[PDB]
Structure 1
Amino acid sequence: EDGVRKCKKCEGPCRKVCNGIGIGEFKDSLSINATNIKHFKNCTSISGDLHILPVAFRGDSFTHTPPLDPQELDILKTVKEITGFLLIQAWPENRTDLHAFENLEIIRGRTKQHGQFSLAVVSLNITSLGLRSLKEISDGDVIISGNKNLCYANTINWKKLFGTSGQKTKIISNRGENSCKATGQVCHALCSPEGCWGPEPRDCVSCRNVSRGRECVDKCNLLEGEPREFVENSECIQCHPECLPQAMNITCTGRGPDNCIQCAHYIDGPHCVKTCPAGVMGENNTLVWKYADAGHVCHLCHPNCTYGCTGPGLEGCPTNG
């Protein structure tokens, strides 16, 4: 079970806040060129505005700045929050989606491009967006234009991502819905009609049937197979290992050990245990000992037999060394 959300702190070391292009250390910097991209490494929140103009990839000779290698973009795969706006005006052809932003989830929109835009994806040689993680575009309007071979962008119900009232969404002159559907570049079957960031089941706004981890799936593993799961708000989560997987019925009502049908080993109180407690330091700083009934029910053993137990009460306890 992936019961722990972040695992160790939040990532490897953990969360860092960096300034945006044209603000702070990147003052008087027009775009994210091959000079300041290295200062965005190990950074979860990039407060401010991000800019990727053609100058970054071409290289500006007069500012002693070099051309950007498309493999450097992966330095932004750690960014998930943008307090200002994201302005992407140029991106390579060897990549069909916004590869570097595969983990961006929240874009606030305090700062806006021309006081109107939060997301600007214009003139890009891509075929899909691939912003699978983006859940909220808080304020600014969205512009997606001049992306000749780009499909799937018109599918997204931007109303779900929007927060502020009247958020306009200029999605014009891309790869028409006529050609997109005729070539099989439509939203996935497992993907709900609420739009998708591409064809892959992971690229999805919401799931039509259910989800599991980072994918839209049809089955939830309730009645059979790999770890028996239960459905909670369109999500598949496996029942506690100490729950005998039942056929004809679902293995659990919830997440915990005490929320399942029947324990595969013994049963201490409401909890399903692999063995009855045999000398555990109890919450009252004292060793707790128990025994197993005929029906596998853990009962507290007699106080007299302290360093061990076999049956009920004060019966059988002197062992031969």
Structure 2
Amino acid sequence: QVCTGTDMKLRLPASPETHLDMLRHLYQGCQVVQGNLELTYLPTNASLSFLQDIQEVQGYVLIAHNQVRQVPLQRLRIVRGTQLFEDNYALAVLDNGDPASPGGLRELQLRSLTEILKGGVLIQRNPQLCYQDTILWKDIFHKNNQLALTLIDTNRSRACHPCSPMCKGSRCWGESSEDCQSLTRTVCAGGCARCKGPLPTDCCHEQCAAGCTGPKHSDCLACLHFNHSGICELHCPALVTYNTDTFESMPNPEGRYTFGASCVTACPYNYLSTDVGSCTLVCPLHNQEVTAEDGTQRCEKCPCARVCYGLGMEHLREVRAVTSANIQEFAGCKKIFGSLAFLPESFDGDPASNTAPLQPEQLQVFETLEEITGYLYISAWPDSLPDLSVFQNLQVIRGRILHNGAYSLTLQGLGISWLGLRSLRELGSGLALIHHNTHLCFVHTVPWDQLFRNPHQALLHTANRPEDECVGEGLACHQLCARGHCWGPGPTQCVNCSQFLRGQECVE
């Protein structure tokens, strides 16, 4: 029921062909989206009904380059705006249409949208879109959301029918009466931030956001800060309380962690329990990730060990791929904190600095790697390597950082005949995508679902070597493989053995 969005922005999907299923797998059944919610480059005939469940977005909401006439986000109530589009917009709609009926967005239909916590609104170049200019946006922007930008492009090729006659003030998201925007902020008697009506008795509890059922902290539709079992509070109750005469620690049975905008009893899988009582993915400076014997993580004081970092972290924040100039940074690593990527640039080198192209022996630095905290993206690989076995010892991909905010594992355009990633056991989060891997077999010979740890993640694949061809050539799994499942040819590539093992070999 809770999932994250992506970070593709206005960039084309790596595999547009599977993009709609990606969204389907990610969002069907998801009420709350962490991070930003982005729908970009979707076709006219896309079916997006799986988005009908979304109620809240932690970050910004972006609709762009879609030819989609309708986007079923009418249930959305609040945009929290942790990140803004172009650092300014909580919500933005761009280029959703064509230059038989034309494609492009016609209505927003955000009838349940009541609030923008922070950030403005940007609507541009959407020639088929109506009523973007009727919404009394100042009523939606939070009281303290003074970045009340309304960059609304009203240049439309499509004529707009007036808003249903039942809409007071003709403020609507679409023609229907149901698409009329209720005014609940600038119309409140008593001067309260939010209300249900013209009376002061209609005022929402002061700790409430995006509207209410009443004046109590137990009467809100969405909390300003945290939702503790339906109760709105500034913060989650402390995990430990104190007797200040002696400063005795008293773990609080009612104490909760802060995650998202709600209170939890424990951090979600792959999240770390901080000393703060917050759930993170990344520890504060001078704290380290510690894994408990029960498999969960926490941030604890570190004194501090040298830590191996990947792309997206520390001095590698600006680095897009591992280059030949970065290899030594992984020497001696078992766990890398960050992402890795092997893109043509890695293998082309860098004429601006005359960096040599990455050689296959330099990838040996990763043979000792057991865990990556970020994502792995390969779009280029030496053709001398028939597989990705240099990472055969990689057991865990956590997906803390996702490629374009979506993938924890992506492989594309490769000549590898098999993956060979025999140690992989878990894909902690994120999507996996295999595409255009012209010569790659053993795609459906892997019980892929066994390494997925969430209903909101799945393996997507397209245009790879057809299994039909792999089958015709006998690129089948060894008869001693559990379930007939493997990562590549031979007794050593089995996901598990039905037999005794000798080294990597299933033997009988």
**Contact (CA 8 Å) 1:124, 1:147: kept in 2 or not?**
yes
Does the 8 Å contact 1:194/1:206 carry over to 2? no
Deviation at 1:213, TM superposition (A): 4.2
Are residue 23 (structure 1) and residue 316 (structure 2) matched? no
Partner of 1:41: 331
TM-score normalised by L of structure 2: 0.39
Q: Distance in 2 between matches of 1:171 and 1:78?
A: 28
Aligned to 1:198: 488
State the distance in 2 between where 1:165 and 1:194 align: 25
Aligned equivalent of 1:142: 432
Contact (CA 8 Å) 2:429, 2:457: kept in 1 or not? Answer: yes
Q: Is the 8 A contact 1:74 1:99 kept in 2?
A: no
Structure 1 residues 241-268: Cα deviation after superposition (integer angstroms, max 9, x where no partner): xxxxxxxxxxxxxxxxxxxxxxxxxxxx
Map 1:1-321 to 2 at 5 A. Answer: 17-193=307-483, 195-218=485-508
SS of match in other structure, 2:486:
coil
Return the letter of the residue paired with 1:55.
E
The answer as to whether partners of 1:16 and 1:43 remain within 8 angstroms in 2 is: no
Which amino acid in structure 2 is aligned with residue 109 of structure 1? G
Question: 2:390 aligns to what SS in structure 1?
Answer: helix
Q: How many residues align?
A: 204
Q: Distance in 2 between the 1:208 and 1:125 partners? A: 30
Look up the match of 1:319.
none
Flag the 1:34–1:166 CA change in 2: closer, same or farther, 3 A: same
Q: Is the 8 A contact 1:91 1:124 kept in 2?
A: yes
What's the offset of the Cα at 1:63? 4.1
- The CA distance in 2 between the partners of 1:71 and 1:213, in whole Å, is 23
Letter in 2 for 1:145: H
Cα pair distance change 1:201/1:17, threshold 3 Å: farther
Aligned equivalents of 2:335, 2:484: Cα separation in 1: 27
Larger radius of gyration: 1
Q: TM-score, normalised by structure 1?
A: 0.60
**Kept after mapping to 2: 8 A contact 1:49/1:82:** yes
Alignment CA distance shift 1:64-1:25 (3 Å): farther
Contact 1:151 1:185 in 2 (8 A): yes
- Residue aligned with 1:193, SS: helix
Q: Distance in 1 between matches of 2:493 and 2:367?
A: 16
**Structure 2 stretches lacking a partner, 5+ long:** 1-304
Amino acid at match of 1:84: G
Q: Cα deviation per residue 1:267-317 (whole Å; 9 max; x = unaligned)?
A: xxxxxxxxxxxxxxxxxxxxxxxxxxxxxxxxxxxxxxxxxxxxxxxxxxx
- Partners of 2:477 and 2:405 lie apart in 1 by 32
RMSD of the alignment, in Å?
1.7
Q: Amino acid of the residue matched to residue 147 of structure 1? A: N
Paired with 2:452 and 2:507, the residues of 1 have a C-alpha distance of 25
- Give the CA deviation at 1:42: 0.6
Q: Percent identity?
A: 41
Matches of 2:501 and 2:377, distance apart in 1: 31
